[model samples]
Target: RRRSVQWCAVSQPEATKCFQWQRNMRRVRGPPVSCIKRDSPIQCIQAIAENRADAVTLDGGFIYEAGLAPYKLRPVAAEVYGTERQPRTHYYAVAVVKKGGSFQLNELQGLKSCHTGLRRTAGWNVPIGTLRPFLDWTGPPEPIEAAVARFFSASCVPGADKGQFPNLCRLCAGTGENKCAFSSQEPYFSYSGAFKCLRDGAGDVAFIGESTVFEDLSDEAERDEYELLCPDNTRKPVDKFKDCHLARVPSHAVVARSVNGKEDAIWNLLRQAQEKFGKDKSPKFQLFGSPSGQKDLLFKDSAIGFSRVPPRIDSGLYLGS
Candidate 1:
């Protein structure tokens, strides 16, 4: 009996990719696959734990949240990035700022900010955790968002609710219902969009992954207008992420249940699918291309292939203590 792998999708574009993936699997007569849609990554985690979906790819930050007592999910495969000669399993989380004012890292209060989303690694986790010491947070006694609301003058923090704090999504450009949504529905939802928020002067600073600026801006002169806010309260050129960044986090990974997660089946499907449809392999479907202008879809556009995660590494272990 061939058990179809149920993949969780977080956006309309992501769902499109999943649908295409399912159809392409049939074309090659590979493993049967299915698609399930959810509005956010947290919901996708719940879907997997409740057995509605078998797998969902998540960044390093979401992996830790998924590994909590109840869900207890584990990453089964890593999305390998970079060139074939130099495969990379890690990416840098950084704070991007326009090169106008002399505002360093420490003097960020009262500034308009943009984030990738609620708990996204580079957008939220790394940036907030780095500012933890100065945030006046009392450790889970209150929603950490209250502290964030007090810190920035206004922000476009996607996946967050505006009912509690109006300033949280004040700068977001999405229309009603889609405003500050977790998916591509929000105009400032991901790395590309968050940077656009800053570029458009909607926000003074944008928190995103290191590779974002280069991906969206082809001109080197245009790229030089943006800078990275270093942890040392200084700013540097965008490409100087190695010398200046919030955190060097693990690459995004596909998570599955710890028990009867169909680990091998997931790998079997991804292994063949990537080889057959990845990048330039197939003309009809691209496993890594996002021509829909939605940036990263089901998987990062830069990812070349998948690598199995060792059995010894759980979500927390992968994230560290």
Candidate 2:
């Protein structure tokens, strides 16, 4: 009835998770969910704005975009990472480079790079924003991708057009025409995949969240093989991400229309789902885990719970200048 929700999904795998989620919701008894599949987060946002859908989990980049004019949305809930004892609302965006070289953050001009995907927070937004001053972009009339394409010798920036920005997808590991497709189809697509691009020597550096290296590789080896590029132009151990990061970012959030967004309904749905499916709640279905080989499908796998955004905190306020 009033608590029904239409959750937007960006990919087939993501939609599959949503399908299973809504299906299980009936057995568990809570807000019934309807799933809508869209090709990208912006499209999903458009759908939500157009009333074709209601909510979607978006990265800080997309959150900022959604907070803008045409598709004004707000963060109704945030995915909390870390643990219940010390739940964190933010994560560090770090640049991971293999140790044994003298390359510093300031000297990334012609290096090969790997990014989680286009327009993604850790993968693109924060990193690109950090390097904006150095880019050849004249701003507007020039896609930033063009500047990025010229900055790096070659890169695996998944979701970028290979035809329009060939160098951006040059290092990507895919044979299909959609080699650098945004979905799981590309090997260098997300956090772990971006790390794979670096590990495979396809790229000199990987732009990913701080937790990625820790999650993908054992802590011991991770520290020995990788270093985080600090904004200070120095490189530190991967574990020093806190002091050596591009930016400390807000966790991904579930965004809904700011005007008639069904905020309470979505929050209630999340609360019920978290209580029943959070982490080890039940193996029958996991609200955060993507056991199907996909990581962070609908929400981050490491998220312990959700934190409701205060009504006063709109998307623009949440994403500071």
Candidate 3:
């Protein structure tokens, strides 16, 4: 008898999709699958460590966190992104702002900011880390929320505790508990949502990945209205991401317990599922599509396929630490 697999999902829609695919997959592969819902990647990783979940896809930044003590899960599979014919395993992190804005890299203070999420690489880590020097705050003086709050006039860093640091969640679009939520339940919680915050004029600048600029503002005219803030303190057109970007980070991946015996089964199941319902597999039920308008659900939409990580490649190596 095959052991049933439980996959942790970051959102309810993603969990539902996993259940749907789990049912559909019964007609195609071995080992039954189940879904578990988690509000954040941290929760999902925690579940995997506790054996409540067998696996879940996580961003490179979260992967860094997961690699830490208590939950030393390994990346079992890496997402292959880029074009179908020339797929790669990395993407650029960048800071974006209005084209006509007079602000430069040194002039970030007092600006309204929008982040994808508090723990995300592009949205929080890369941008905030880059801006830390300019924040005029000293070492370990206050909470990061307080520093960022004082740095910007207002912000929508989803997942920030509003009660402790009200300014960080001040600009979020949702109300009540939904406000500043870590998940998409808050409209300003992901790549597109952060962009939407800037687009709707709620925030002055948005921290996001380069691909999001192309995906959401594909129209040349609309795209032209946006520009990237390079580390060199200059702005460049959106299309020039390669030339004017913040940092190049590793792609997202599926993680599992380090000593799980069902490694082969998990990969086989994922490989088969991708071949059947992955990119260009089915318009009716695209396994990779963000049906809920949330990007990177279950897996990245741009990802063409998955590749197993080498046994020697631990999380630190995978994350290029």
- Quantify all predictions' global Cα lDDT against the true fold: 0.89, 0.90, 0.84
Quick one: ranking by lDDT, best first? 2, 1, 3
Q: Write candidate 1's Cα lDDT for 1-321 as tens digits.
A: 339999999877789889999999999998878999998888999999999999999988799889996899999999988788988888898989888779988888888899998888999998998988767777777888989999999999987888997788998889998898777878898888899999999999999999899989999999999899999999999999999999988889999999988898999989999999997899999988897577888889888999899896799887773
Best by TM-score: 1
Worst window of 10 by summed lDDT in candidate 2: 214-223
Report each candidate's C-alpha RMSD, comma-separated, in the order given: 1.6, 1.8, 1.8
- The model with the greatest lDDT is 2
The worst-scoring run of ten residues by lDDT in candidate 3 lies at 136-145
lDDT of 2 by residue, 1-321 (tens): 445799999888899999999989989887789899998888999999998898999889889889888999989999998778888998989999999989888899999999999999999998999998888898999999999998999999998988899999999997777689887788888898899999999999999999888777875955688898999999999888878999988999999999888988999999999999888999799998896468888898778899999996888888773
Give the alpha carbon lDDT tens digit for every residue of 21-76 in model 3: 78878866545778889878999999989888888888877998888889998888
Which ranges of candidate 3 are over 4 A from the true structure? 29-32
* Global lDDT of model 1: 0.89
Per-residue error (Å), model 3, residue 14: 0.8
TM per model? Answer: 0.95, 0.94, 0.94
Looking at model 3, the pairs that clash are none
lDDT of 2 at 205: 94
